[PDB]
Amino acid sequence: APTVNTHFGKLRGARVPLPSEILGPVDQYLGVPYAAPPIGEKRFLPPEPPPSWSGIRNATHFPPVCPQNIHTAVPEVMLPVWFTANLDIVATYIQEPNEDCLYLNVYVPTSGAKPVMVYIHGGSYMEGTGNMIDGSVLASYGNVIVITLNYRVGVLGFLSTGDQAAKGNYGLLDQIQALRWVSENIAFFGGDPRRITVFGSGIGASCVSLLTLSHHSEGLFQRAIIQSGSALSSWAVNYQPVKYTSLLADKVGCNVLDTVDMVDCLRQKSAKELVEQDIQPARYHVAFGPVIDGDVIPDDPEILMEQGEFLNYDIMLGVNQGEGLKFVEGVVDPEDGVSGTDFDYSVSNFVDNLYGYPEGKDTLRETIKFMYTDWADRDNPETRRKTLVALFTDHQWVEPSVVTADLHARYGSPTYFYAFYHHCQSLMKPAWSDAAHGDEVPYVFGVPMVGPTDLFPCNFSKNDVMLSAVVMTYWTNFAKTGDPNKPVPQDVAWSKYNPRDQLYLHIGLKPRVRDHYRATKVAFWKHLVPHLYN
Amino acid sequence: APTVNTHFGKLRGARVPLPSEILGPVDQYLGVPYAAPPIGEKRFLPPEPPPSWSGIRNATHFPPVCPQNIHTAVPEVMLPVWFTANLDIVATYIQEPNEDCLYLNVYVPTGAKPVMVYIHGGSYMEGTGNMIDGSVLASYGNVIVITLNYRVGVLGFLSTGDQAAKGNYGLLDQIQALRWVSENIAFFGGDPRRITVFGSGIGASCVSLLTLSHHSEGLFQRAIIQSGSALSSWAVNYQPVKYTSLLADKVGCNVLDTVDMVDCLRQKSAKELVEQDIQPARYHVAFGPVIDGDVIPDDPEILMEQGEFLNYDIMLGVNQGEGLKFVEGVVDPEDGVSGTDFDYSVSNFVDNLYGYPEGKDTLRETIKFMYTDWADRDNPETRRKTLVALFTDHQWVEPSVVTADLHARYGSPTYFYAFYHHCQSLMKPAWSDAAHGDEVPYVFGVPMVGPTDLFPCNFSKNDVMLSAVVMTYWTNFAKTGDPNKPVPQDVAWSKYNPRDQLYLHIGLKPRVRDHYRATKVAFWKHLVPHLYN
Ligand SMILES: *[C@@H]1O[C@H](CO)[C@@H](O)[C@H](O)[C@H]1NC(C)=O
Ligand SMILES: *[C@@H]1O[C@H](CO)[C@@H](O)[C@H](O)[C@H]1NC(C)=O
Ligand SMILES: *[C@@H]1O[C@H](CO)[C@@H](O)[C@H](O)[C@H]1NC(C)=O
Ligand SMILES: *[C@@H]1O[C@H](CO)[C@@H](O)[C@H](O)[C@H]1NC(C)=O
């Protein structure tokens, strides 16, 4: 009977033994309320502290997830491969969602106060839950506390009228609120409030990125790990909340004169209704997500990076070899190639969606075509496919991540960069593909140590286990000391990243330090492309 | 007393033994007239057959070279490094030039032998085949080597853009010299059926043009085009009318009627026409080959598409650092180039070649980007290398590749190379790679004789070994049209085609590679035309 005392009352967790003998068991406390339920008047309002309970509270079972619908259309590209490939298994987690969903899960190892790693999940700002990820392995192996949380998503989480009626960013405020709770209470679990690291993958990483740039998050956590995401990608921030919110208002018939009144009208509607609505944004953009409210996000995220807000965090970030898999998947023939006409089509469509037919568009389009053509093997259809993925991977992930890594390490503050060049073999993904979006997740959470799971049907080798131990060792070490190499040595040194040297860690079965990761491509998007048009 | 009978008379050459003991002696016949003197009425007229001579002609000494002046300004970048670095020694060859200068030199080893006809070239204004001694190439490769003299500068390429002066007289001289060889080299033990013509620099620009001419038909079978093309900005003069009239004004021979001004120009001393300081636009030529519609029927690129030169076996290539003189002015004592200096030269380059058209600003930044090493942005030494490469790629590599592509289009025999070696000397900065003309000494086997007045290089044993290799490749091509047959190296030089793009990397360790600087070549060929109108 594992019990822990907190500022709001006592709660009872469970001791669960890992299938692996070598790994020790963990005490896990599921469904701990970190805020008062955001329902009724509380909807579209910042989170409030949870009420206290007089007795011992049961933390044995998973709570309801936040209102969401996987069947309803959402941007496919934004979601991790493991997610879309296994929608059936995911559905078992999402069933019976409730607006009362602000809960978190805690995984504690069985010397001294332990570091705390707070994970932020994320599919597309519309879906997902921390429940899918079981932090037991990461906790027991690295001897740290692992936390997975649930936050308001979609309409309920990010609705904004662009004024005082609905400022937005409620999903982010929940994360802040969840972080305060950990800061004030994790000491009760044997956790160190002074050593708190927050990390996420994909959209989760975009959230982590934004948390580092916020005044509200100041003092709560010390380090961040930003995996395959940034505050700078086209779908990280919604620059038209007013447009998409009114579209919602019309669909539910909540159209009225005063924005204050229409928000109130939205409060009356069932939580289910607001979610189901088919509100599609412009391609590679988001209809409901973080906005620049002037409070939580005081300015354009890039400007905030220049101002130096997030320099007081130790930061580790990186990308995968083939993130943008879904960008070309539609157009790949059975021979695993892409035709020249198809290449020209995708490149042009890419320029259409991202740059929107500006002056000199014809000039840029040809320039993009040139940079991502392998002139040493012009005709090869397979290589044509690789470059096409690379085009999307570089633009949406690599360049924004690198710009972030540069701006953070500008004054020597601790920064680490990586490129993930390995992935499990599975039927979830075409055999010709490299490490795709989210493919780093299983190794971070030590899935090969437990073997194949319902969510990761991968056929893990001994090599997979070996790398997973390595990745976790790097990851937990960073949490403990802000240095990937200390204190637990590998049984290669991960060098610090600075704008001049540009050293990064190539993570694969063959690990090594390298420099200037795709710098020529990164330079193209950062420097040359802004010049070509206007 | 080495004597040979010809269609124009008997002539006696001299037999000279090579300093290398391994190499056998050669019979050399110097100053053989291949055309009637182009003087008086003959000036600015196509070459005519040489008159016969009744006695035995002495061919032991060099004849006068064509009218030229090395002191008078000519574009420095166009000239080979060995030439400009040793103007003093060059001057001894150029002394006493005479308008009666259409002579050639023959080098014969002691069955019928292949004939290699070399065409020299600095800038169309100067030079002579006399400077190059084909004895080594002849004795080692067992082939006949021929170096010729042709009309240069005003006398060689003056054009009024009409019938008064069609131009291309320098090329016509080369054609005429080739006819002479075709009809008479059999008397020397040569095979008229196996004739290869080759040249370096502007000389290579000529060979390229000869292959595209109707006039050259039937004369020669193979060509070796070294560090030159018919497509470079300075290969063809597209404003002959403009520069010719400038000359007329300076000599005071300017008139409305073209026939009369040409006639007046005939009156002037050969001396007067040469000395004149007439500078063309940068990287362009004031006097050179023109598109007359006869010798050069159309734009050289168009002629390539039409397929004129497909019936020739062709071998061509470039050097690693051709464009040395493009950046030499701007190199600091640290052997580096500053960013401001980098931006300056790149901007000036776009100014000269593209002439400030619309979207020049967009193009300028794109050039800057492509030739910046973003993996070592700050390095001043690397900035220097890229600056050399920019000029090297644009002026030599890309035009050469385009030529090689168009020739091998239907599978006709083509071979490509990149020369990645050079001798150590004071002629050239120590940091430099193989520069313009640096392949010449190895082609002509200079290391076999050791350092000469024209090539003060300190040749190592490695230099000798490579020179043997290069000559073996070269002479093999002359004999069979294949670099590998019949004499084996004791590496196989693969044929070049547009898809595979295989080339021979020539250095102390020769090897086959593919798609030589293809990304850079593709930039100049495909992307750059798009940016500006
Ligand atoms: C918690 O669950 C246990 C059974 O697992 C039950 O005995 C206990 O009464 C529950 N506590 C509360 C407060 O409901
Ligand atoms: C899973 O492993 C088995 C061997 O145990 C193999 O037959 C199968 O191909 C593997 N699956 C994938 C997707 O590689
Ligand atoms: C032939 O010419 C050479 C020039 O090198 C001269 O020295 C020689 O005396 C001449 N011989 C005769 C027989 O005229
Ligand atoms: C002369 O040769 C030596 C090596 O034998 C070399 O180090 C030196 O640079 C050479 N000097 C010149 C002027 O070629």
Numbering used by the authors:
A (entry chain A): 38 to 147, 174 to 554, 568 to 610
B (entry chain B): 38 to 147, 175 to 554, 568 to 610
Paper lines:
The X-linked neuroligin 3 (NLGN3) gene encodes the postsynaptic adhesion molecule NLGN3, which interacts with presynaptic neurexins (NRXNs) to organize synaptogenesis. Here, we identified a non-canonical synapse-organizing interaction between NLGN3 and PTPδ splice variants lacking the meB peptide, which competed with NRXNs by steric hindrance. To elucidate the structural mechanism of the NLGN3–PTPδ-meB(–) interaction, we determined the crystal structures of mouse apo-NLGN3 ECD (residues 35–684) at 2.76 Å resolution and NLGN3 ECD in complex with PTPδA3B– Ig1–Fn1 at 3.85 Å resolution.
